[PDB]
Design a protein around this ligand. Structure first.
Ligand SMILES: Nc1nc2c(ncn2[C@@H]2O[C@H](COP(=O)(O)O)[C@@H](O)[C@H]2O)c(=O)[nH]1
Ligand SMILES: [Mg+2]
Ligand SMILES: [Mg+2]
Ligand SMILES: [Mg+2]
Ligand SMILES: [Mg+2]
Ligand SMILES: [Mg+2]
Ligand SMILES: [Mg+2]
Ligand SMILES: [Mg+2]
Ligand SMILES: [Mg+2]
Ligand SMILES: [Mg+2]
Ligand SMILES: [Mg+2]
Ligand SMILES: [Mg+2]
Ligand SMILES: [Mg+2]
Ligand SMILES: [Mg+2]
Ligand SMILES: [Mg+2]
Ligand SMILES: [Mg+2]
Ligand SMILES: [Mg+2]
Ligand SMILES: [Mg+2]
Ligand SMILES: [Mg+2]
Ligand SMILES: [Mg+2]
Ligand SMILES: [Mg+2]
Ligand SMILES: [Mg+2]
Ligand SMILES: [Mg+2]
Ligand SMILES: [Mg+2]
Ligand SMILES: [Mg+2]
Ligand SMILES: [Mg+2]
Ligand SMILES: [Mg+2]
Ligand SMILES: [Mg+2]
Ligand SMILES: [Mg+2]
Ligand SMILES: [Mg+2]
Ligand SMILES: [Mg+2]
Ligand SMILES: [Mg+2]
Ligand SMILES: [Mg+2]
Ligand SMILES: [Mg+2]
Ligand SMILES: [Mg+2]
Ligand SMILES: [Mg+2]
Ligand SMILES: [Mg+2]
Ligand SMILES: [Mg+2]
Ligand SMILES: [Mg+2]
Ligand SMILES: [Mg+2]
Ligand SMILES: [Mg+2]
Ligand SMILES: [Mg+2]
Ligand SMILES: [Mg+2]
Ligand SMILES: [Mg+2]
Ligand SMILES: [Mg+2]
Ligand SMILES: [Mg+2]
Ligand SMILES: [Mg+2]
Ligand SMILES: [Mg+2]
Ligand SMILES: [Mg+2]
Ligand SMILES: [Mg+2]
Ligand SMILES: [Mg+2]
Ligand SMILES: [Mg+2]
Ligand SMILES: [Mg+2]
Ligand SMILES: [Mg+2]
Ligand SMILES: [Mg+2]
Ligand SMILES: [Mg+2]
Ligand SMILES: [Mg+2]
Ligand SMILES: [Mg+2]
Ligand SMILES: [Mg+2]
Ligand SMILES: [Mg+2]
Ligand SMILES: [Mg+2]
Ligand SMILES: [Mg+2]
Ligand SMILES: [Mg+2]
Ligand SMILES: [Mg+2]
Ligand SMILES: [Mg+2]
Ligand SMILES: [Mg+2]
Ligand SMILES: [Mg+2]
Ligand SMILES: [Mg+2]
Ligand SMILES: [Mg+2]
Ligand SMILES: [Mg+2]
Ligand SMILES: [Mg+2]
Ligand SMILES: [Mg+2]
Ligand SMILES: [Mg+2]
Ligand SMILES: [Mg+2]
Ligand SMILES: [Mg+2]
Ligand SMILES: [Mg+2]
Ligand SMILES: [Mg+2]
Ligand SMILES: [Mg+2]
Ligand SMILES: [Mg+2]
Ligand SMILES: [Mg+2]
Ligand SMILES: [Mg+2]
Ligand SMILES: [Mg+2]
Ligand SMILES: [Mg+2]
Ligand SMILES: [Mg+2]
Ligand SMILES: [Mg+2]
Ligand SMILES: [Mg+2]
Ligand SMILES: [Mg+2]
Ligand SMILES: [Mg+2]
Ligand SMILES: [Mg+2]
Ligand SMILES: [Mg+2]
Ligand SMILES: [Mg+2]
Ligand SMILES: [Mg+2]
Ligand SMILES: [Zn+2]
Lengths: 153, 110, 51
RNA sequence: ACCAAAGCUAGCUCAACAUACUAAACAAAUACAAAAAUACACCAAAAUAAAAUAAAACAUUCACCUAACAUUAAAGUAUAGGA
RNA sequence: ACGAGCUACCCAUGAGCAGUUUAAAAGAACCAACUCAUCUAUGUGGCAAAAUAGUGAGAAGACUUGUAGGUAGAGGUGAAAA
RNA sequence: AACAAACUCCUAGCCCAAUACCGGACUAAUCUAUUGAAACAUAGAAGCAAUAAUGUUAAUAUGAGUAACAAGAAGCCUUUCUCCUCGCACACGCUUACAUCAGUAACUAAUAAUAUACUGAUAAUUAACAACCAAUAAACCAAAACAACACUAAAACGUUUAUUAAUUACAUUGUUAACCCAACACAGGAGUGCACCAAGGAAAGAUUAAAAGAAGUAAAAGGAACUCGGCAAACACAAACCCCGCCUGUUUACCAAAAACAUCACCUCUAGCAUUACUAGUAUUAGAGGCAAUGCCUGCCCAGUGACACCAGUUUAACGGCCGCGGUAUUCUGACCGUGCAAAGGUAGCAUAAUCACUUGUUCUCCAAAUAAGGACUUGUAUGAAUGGCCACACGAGGGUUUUACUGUCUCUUACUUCCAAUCAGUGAAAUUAACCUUCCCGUGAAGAGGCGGGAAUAAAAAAAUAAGACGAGAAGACCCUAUGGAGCUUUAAUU
RNA sequence: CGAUGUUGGAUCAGGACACCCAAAUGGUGCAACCGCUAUUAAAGGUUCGUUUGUUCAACGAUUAAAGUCCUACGUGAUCUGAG
């Protein structure tokens, strides 16, 4: 009975789970876009989002510093978190991460795959799904309705 | 526990041709507006994502060449440029990667 | 428990046994046409004229 | 429709004959731990065949059972046997 | 006829035994390497035609162990368990 | 009445069931003799006909796409991270499995990616290390142990002197490896020297987070109430008492490690001796045995059976034995009396025992409660003295009992992790299996029915779970009996 | 007998009624409380410990009561193995 369990079991145990996410996160902060097992990426996303929040607490905060010290494994990144990533998220509260499902891995294990990304990175943009345009027949029919909600008010 | 009798072919056909063991037809397949290959509706297009992946690889390669070693990563934002381009005033003060290829149609300048 | 398949068919051109042919290939014909006669460009309008 | 199926050859068997009976191949190496050119020694030998089995058990006995004399008969006779 | 390259017991010839405790290298003591195989759970076409995990017993001796040699079935060998 | 058969009529016939044994008539397919010539006839011959041997070989199913198997993460692709620690060399063994380039549709890897293991081509380990590498005389009693000097069990390892030893660059041979023995690229077995990391490696193919199973950590109050037993576990890692063996040691490789064996000690027997054992020894020695250190002891018997003495006679630390009936002290007992039989008549000790039964003997202690444990009583009429009897120290993975302590053993279970698990992808076994279109009840029946009778029930198919039945699978029952079937062992079996 | 694996526990219990408890009654050498009998009723219940391998049995403490039996002396392809 799994009721209300938020964290999925990975690795060799709870600790191995933390270290798996450690590596994933470090990879994410370095390269800013990575791809991995859909489940693991999903699991990661929360952490990846909170790390930016500790980053916003600034260099001088001790808690944030040893936090970043534990999570970012290659130490050289710790400045990047504080002096690059954390600044470029200022206005936005929670919007840091984009996560999409990629087609299943071509290897024989055929896994379920996801790409995860920090917004505002400098890379060729992911081919996101576009909503239909407004010129589409159905949407036009709705535009009619809208303008008649404006005309009747 | 060992089977008491050989299961006949009729019984067996009943088991393995049963509806629940058949592959189920996927109805969510569609065409990518871009390249006109196939994709499932809730998933990124494989072909397009390959374009992006290759280019990303090349960029990362060339930004590994600008870093003399494993542990040097910039303390500044970076921006990637293509043949016949120059850094904007807004984009200066940043790390600059210069690629030979002309800027791809899907990739915007931003 | 140890037995393998046979018969993977291959065509290998090699010049050495091709040279060792004891009865060299006898041709009834030559593959090309030596001199190609190149006709008049108005040969359609001279065809309705007999002489 | 897959998996499959069908061949007639390779050689063999049994006798006959036959000269006579250890084939072929030997450059080197071969009985050192065979195939390793070269140092004072040793070297060599023989003793009954037995039992399974039959006798409805088993105890004397039990044809043939790696010893040239064939064939037609005498004859399954004389004989021998826990007779 | 063939077998002692496993194993039983021998013969030659090598090799190991740290730390601690003791006047002591005393078939004493604690405890590794090493050697055994107590109890339990796994395992039971198994990792394994006898193992794994824990736990145990000995650990300068009637100790462990390498190499070469010996004893042969009416036999050998045996701190007898046929 | 009717309905109801291998009975009997009716219409036709080729005109009356059957197991072991017996008789008969035909006949498939081969071959041969003559025919024949779109596959036959008359004869003659035979390796002359397969639904049954846990038949043989090959091939295929079923079980089953089940059990089971594997590659730490990202990335700029061999760079960083996250973890775990059997490493380098030599000997023995293996024999090119090593190296470079290329290939991998399929073949090896229990799966891929790719390649130390599949395929092909081409190369390679170079002696200084190692192997190979004198005889005959003669002086030497004097351990290795940091060797000063000693201990007992008396100890591996060489100098010098003399006599001759071809005398003259370069001889020959081992040099790869991720390796060997286990049918496997096997969690097993493997000698030595150095190291504990500077070297080696990866527990997870991807998910999900059901049961049951495995492995772990934690647990309210209680603390052995669990149970054959505190087995296992534990924040405990302590004390006592019995039985048996003195002790360290040994044993049934693969169900027994013990109370069995050995053993110091003590005892019997047998030997007066020389070049292969015993022994290069000589009765304070050497063999054959018994018993089990120490301590107190080891009583009586030579009639039988042995063995000495070839007969007498001697031997029990040789095989082995060690009794009754009647009458008596006012009474139960029986010092005493009678008498029979024996070779001697069971002595000392110990005792309801690891000791036929009676037996849960009786009583005391221990517990709220004991067929347990301990202490006594004790004819044990079947104890008992080297096939040893009694005490005892120390010792014991031996077998029993108490106390403390500790605890999920239990009251009475619970939470969470990992492996299994279930889903996705790859590969893909096993016993088993007359055929199955494979229900329940009561009856029946080779005496316990899915299958018969009488009733009930009943669209068809997966996937997950449980084990009541299929007298479920395994192994031609090890128990039991039989066979004029075996073998091992012992003798007072018979032949020798 | 080309195997129908055997005692007692554990777990889960299915059934009978010849009722131990709970319910309704008849008779009493039934005043009352207790009891002793007999009829009817099987939905539900039927304890925890010390010793024994034990089933029985003895004993301690209780209970509304601590039933008698059948089920391959129920149940080992679920466990135990003391006997
Ligand atoms: N000795 C004997 N056995 C018979 C006789 N009849 C029938 N049998 C036996 O009975 C059995 C078969 O009986 P059925 O099948 O003939 O009714 C077989 O064992 C068969 O030998 C007879 O007359 N004598
Ligand atoms: Mg006979
Ligand atoms: Mg016969
Ligand atoms: Mg016989
Ligand atoms: Mg004979
Ligand atoms: Mg005579
Ligand atoms: Mg040997
Ligand atoms: Mg030492
Ligand atoms: Mg010692
Ligand atoms: Mg072990
Ligand atoms: Mg444990
Ligand atoms: Mg240990
Ligand atoms: Mg010890
Ligand atoms: Mg000890
Ligand atoms: Mg030998
Ligand atoms: Mg014999
Ligand atoms: Mg013998
Ligand atoms: Mg021994
Ligand atoms: Mg014995
Ligand atoms: Mg015996
Ligand atoms: Mg009729
Ligand atoms: Mg008739
Ligand atoms: Mg008839
Ligand atoms: Mg014929
Ligand atoms: Mg035949
Ligand atoms: Mg057939
Ligand atoms: Mg079979
Ligand atoms: Mg058959
Ligand atoms: Mg299949
Ligand atoms: Mg199945
Ligand atoms: Mg599985
Ligand atoms: Mg792995
Ligand atoms: Mg090999
Ligand atoms: Mg190679
Ligand atoms: Mg493969
Ligand atoms: Mg080497
Ligand atoms: Mg996992
Ligand atoms: Mg897995
Ligand atoms: Mg579970
Ligand atoms: Mg558990
Ligand atoms: Mg615990
Ligand atoms: Mg507790
Ligand atoms: Mg108890
Ligand atoms: Mg109890
Ligand atoms: Mg224990
Ligand atoms: Mg304890
Ligand atoms: Mg204790
Ligand atoms: Mg002992
Ligand atoms: Mg054993
Ligand atoms: Mg042993
Ligand atoms: Mg022991
Ligand atoms: Mg054992
Ligand atoms: Mg003894
Ligand atoms: Mg004495
Ligand atoms: Mg004594
Ligand atoms: Mg005596
Ligand atoms: Mg005498
Ligand atoms: Mg006498
Ligand atoms: Mg006494
Ligand atoms: Mg008795
Ligand atoms: Mg006696
Ligand atoms: Mg005696
Ligand atoms: Mg006695
Ligand atoms: Mg002592
Ligand atoms: Mg003890
Ligand atoms: Mg011992
Ligand atoms: Mg012991
Ligand atoms: Mg809990
Ligand atoms: Mg699968
Ligand atoms: Mg049906
Ligand atoms: Mg029935
Ligand atoms: Mg019917
Ligand atoms: Mg029926
Ligand atoms: Mg079942
Ligand atoms: Mg059964
Ligand atoms: Mg069976
Ligand atoms: Mg039989
Ligand atoms: Mg049996
Ligand atoms: Mg018997
Ligand atoms: Mg008979
Ligand atoms: Mg006989
Ligand atoms: Mg005799
Ligand atoms: Mg039977
Ligand atoms: Mg059967
Ligand atoms: Mg019930
Ligand atoms: Mg009644
Ligand atoms: Mg009542
Ligand atoms: Mg009831
Ligand atoms: Mg009965
Ligand atoms: Mg039963
Ligand atoms: Mg039972
Ligand atoms: Mg059963
Ligand atoms: Zn596309």
């Amino acid at each position: 009975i799994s009721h209300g369990r938020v964290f999925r079991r990975l690795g060799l145990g709870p600790e191995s789970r933390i270290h798996l996410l450690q590596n994933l996160l470090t990879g994410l902060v370095r390269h800013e876009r990575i791809e991995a097992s859909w489940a693991r990426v999903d699991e990661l996303r929360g952490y990846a989002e909170k790390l930016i929040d500790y980053g916003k607490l600034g260099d001088t905060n001790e808690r944030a510093m040893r936090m970043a010290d534990f999570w970012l494994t290659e130490k050289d990144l710790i400045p990047k978190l504080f002096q690059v990533l954390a600044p470029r998220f200022q206005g936005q509260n929670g919007g840091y991460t984009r996560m999409l499902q990629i087609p299943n891995r071509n290897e024989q294990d055929r896994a379920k795959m996801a790409v995860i990304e920090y917004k505002g990175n400098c890379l060729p943009p992911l081919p996101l799904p576009r909503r239909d345009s407004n010129l589409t027949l159905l949407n036009q029919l709705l535009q009619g309705l809208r303008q008649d909600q404006e005309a009747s008010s | 526990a060992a089977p008491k009798n050989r299961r006949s072919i009729e019984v067996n056909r009943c088991r393995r041709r049963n509806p629940q063991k058949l592959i189920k037809v996927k109805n969510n397949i569609d065409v990518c507006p871009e390249c006109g290959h196939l994709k499932q509706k809730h998933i990124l297009c494989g072909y397009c994502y390959e374009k992006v992946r290759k280019e990303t690889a090349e960029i990362r390669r060339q930004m590994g060449k600008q870093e003399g070693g494993p542990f040097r990563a910039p303390t500044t934002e970076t921006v990637v440029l293509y043949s016949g381009e120059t850094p904007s005033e807004q984009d200066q003060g940043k790390r600059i990667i210069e690629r030979e290829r002309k800027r791809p149609s899907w990739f915007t300048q931003n | 428990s140890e037995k393998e398949f046979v018969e993977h068919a291959r065509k290998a051109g090699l010049v050495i046994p091709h040279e060792r042919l004891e009865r060299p290939i006898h041709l009834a014909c030559t593959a090309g046409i030596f001199d190609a006669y190149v006709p008049p460009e108005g040969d359609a309008r001279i065809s309705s004229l007999s002489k």
